[PDB]
């Protein structure tokens, strides 16, 4: 009957299974989950500054369509487009639509710097029944519809603006594509318009095209929206003999620096989370996640797996 | 494990060990009792916590990205915008799968090492006064009261004390 001293290790009744290099199912005492699979279902307004267009997409907000009155001068870290956003104004298309909405979303600002232009020899502030603001004919709040002098000519526009500031100016303008040769002559008196916006280093010129388009808001015509950037020291020139949709100023090109747009339908709650997704916010300390590939902020890295168990204990052998 | 102590010559674990990860379990004249071992338990936890902290450092923070969902076919550009994201997700998924499997293989080997570490420490303590039964227990060839047992567990056991009794009981 000699004394014996034994050496061992702890164990538990129900252990956790983990993967290793040499086995798919090894039971260990304790393990932590590294893949986050849950979300709040609401977008947390902290610490990221959010902006809800909530009836207006970003571009409609930049142009100033009826619904987007609340978006003026807004600043954001994340703009939020909704699926319920609706066009409300004269029908328009935007060549390279995703590029101009990704410039407005990076800049993270709808601050419109208003400027006074002198469109010599044209009627101004035209409105359309397809763009109603309070049951009344309106237009884009940041665009000026120019038509011929009342019973007169479309005096040739040669307006210029020099960028004196230290920032890059983003000008939003457009070109009206009439529906019939009557409308063209009824509005600008030329048989064929022309819009040429230019800087010293880049230019763009458009001659409109008459024809029938599907009726949108009882309108068969269209407005093609364009944009021109102006660097400090450069000058922009709006030259047109017809069909010009003039600007009312410019936007300020800001720095990306957590500025983007997220297309979601979830309500903005009162929570706090440094990570947003299209499916809501993520609150976790885990490295990975299977919530959504769309992730904005300090987020876990999106993976395909739904569970990756890291072993935090020895081999469990009861 | 690479050392074959846990799930090896140590048959199974002790569920009565709730105050530590590694422990002693003796049988002397006065009776029987179990005590955890702090040093071995702490060394294992430090290396698990150490690799846990390494895996949490929040380094991923992007805001402006490329679109990852599309409401109309476009062709060349959309194909690329998709293929770029798919390529990234696959690579990160591999980076995660390999990380977990590798860290676990190391984790299990670390805990199997610390168990053998403790055993080898006690082996060197007695060092002619006991013998390795094989199951992780030492047959102490001398009377070892509770004060003697504690001396083995807090590292003050002087083998020269019992060397004369122990060798005699072993050889004959």
């Amino acid at each position: 009957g000699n004394p014996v001293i034994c050496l061992g290790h702890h164990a538990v009744e129900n252990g956790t299974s983990v993967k290793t290099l040499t086995d798919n199912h090894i039971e260990v005492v304790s393990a932590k989950e590294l893949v986050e699979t849950n979300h709040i279902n609401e977008l947390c307004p902290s610490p990221l500054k959010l902006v809800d267009g909530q009836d207006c997409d970003l571009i409609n907000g930049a142009l100033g369509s009826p619904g987007c009155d609340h978006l003026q001068d807004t600043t954001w870290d994340v703009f939020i487009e909704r699926p319920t956003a609706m066009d409300t104004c004269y029908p328009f298309d935007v060549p390279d639509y995703q590029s101009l909405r990704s410039i407005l979303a990076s800049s993270g600002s709808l601050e419109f710097i208003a400027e006074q232009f002198t469109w010599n020899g044209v009627t101004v502030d035209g409105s359309s029944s397809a763009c109603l603001r309070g049951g009344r004919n309106g237009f884009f709040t940041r665009l000026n519809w120019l038509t011929r002098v009342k019973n007169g000519n479309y005096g040739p526009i040669n307006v210029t603006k020099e960028n004196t500031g230290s920032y890059v100016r983003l000008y939003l303008w457009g070109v009206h594509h009439p529906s019939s040769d009557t409308e063209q002559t009824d509005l600008y008196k030329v048989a064929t318009g022309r819009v040429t916006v230019s800087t010293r280093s880049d230019q763009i010129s458009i001659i409109p095209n008459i024809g029938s388009r599907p009726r949108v808001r009882n309108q068969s015509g269209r407005i093609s929206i364009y944009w021109t950037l102006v660097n400090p020291g450069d000058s922009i020139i709006f030259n047109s003999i017809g069909n010009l949709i003039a600007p009312r100023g410019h936007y300020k090109i800001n720095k990306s620096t957590k500025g983007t747009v997220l297309k979601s339908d979830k309500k903005i709650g009162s929570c706090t989370s440094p990570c947003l997704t299209d499916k809501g916010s993520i609150q976790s300390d885990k490295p990975f996640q299977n919530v959504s590939r769309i992730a904005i902020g300090n987020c876990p890295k999106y993976v395909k797996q739904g569970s990756l168990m890291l072993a935090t204990g020895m081999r469990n052998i009861p | 494990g690479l050392f074959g102590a846990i799930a090896g010559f140590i048959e199974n674990g002790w569920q009565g060990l709730i105050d530590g990860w590694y422990g002693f379990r003796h049988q002397n004249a006065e009776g029987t009792g179990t005590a955890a071992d702090l040093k071995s338990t702490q060394a294992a936890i430090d290396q698990i916590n150490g690799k846990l902290n390494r895996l949490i450092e929040k380094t991923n923070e992007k805001y402006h990205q490329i679109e990852k969902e599309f409401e109309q076919v476009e062709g060349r550009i959309q194909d690329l915008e998709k293929y770029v994201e798919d390529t990234k997700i696959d690579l990160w998924s591999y980076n995660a799968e390999l990380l977990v499997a590798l860290e676990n293989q190391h984790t299990i080997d670390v805990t199997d090492s610390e168990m053998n570490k403790l055993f080898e420490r006690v082996r060197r303590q007695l060092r002619e006064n006991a013998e390795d039964q094989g199951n992780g227990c030492f047959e102490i060839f001398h009377q070892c009261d509770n004060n003697c047992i504690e001396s083995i567990r807090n590292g003050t056991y002087d083998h020269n004390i019992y060397r004369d009794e122990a060798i005699n009981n072993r050889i004959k």
Partner: antibody
Amino acid sequence: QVQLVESGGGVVQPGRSLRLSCAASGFPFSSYGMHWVRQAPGKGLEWVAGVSYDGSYKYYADSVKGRFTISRDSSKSTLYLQMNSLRPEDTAVYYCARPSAIFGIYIILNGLDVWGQGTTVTVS
Amino acid sequence: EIVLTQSPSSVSASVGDRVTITCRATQGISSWLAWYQQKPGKPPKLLIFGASSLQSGVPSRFSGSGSGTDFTLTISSLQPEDFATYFCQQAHSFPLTFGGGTKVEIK
């Protein structure tokens, strides 16, 4: 829900004895080791005593070794701090504290999760 | 023993300042440090265990750092209720050591 209640603190003369008690509630007391930590009034926290889960291994501070005696009871789930040979150095606000459980083990040597309200011991 | 040394011993700051505190010991106490909050007349509350692991329910502004030799308790955006005295704890081996206290006053 889970908390620790202290008691026993009174006014006592040097050289005599007292017994302070710490009743647990809302957790498996007999599974955790436990600690007594005293905040000398004016100074910071000063660990004084600690005991294992079973009660066979007891750890004391060098200032109270052979003078104070810790003990516990599974049947009442209570922690006893039997103080003998008191002196004004031992004047302090006594706290019974619970070392944190880590991973799966209820270690005795860790940070302290739960504290009692604080029962003051005055020695004139 | 192991001797802890909190620096500074006291500090005054306004709400919203980047507060930094240090715990400083002798031995290799690996990663065993526990920071505590303490209001006057009240028992401590565990803020950080493992010297970096945030305690459950504690706001994310409290953060801990350090390993082995040099330790640090950082607070990003101080709040009115965060006015308190702070203690660090050694937990590598017995006996348990605490610090001299680092109180945050009003500026």
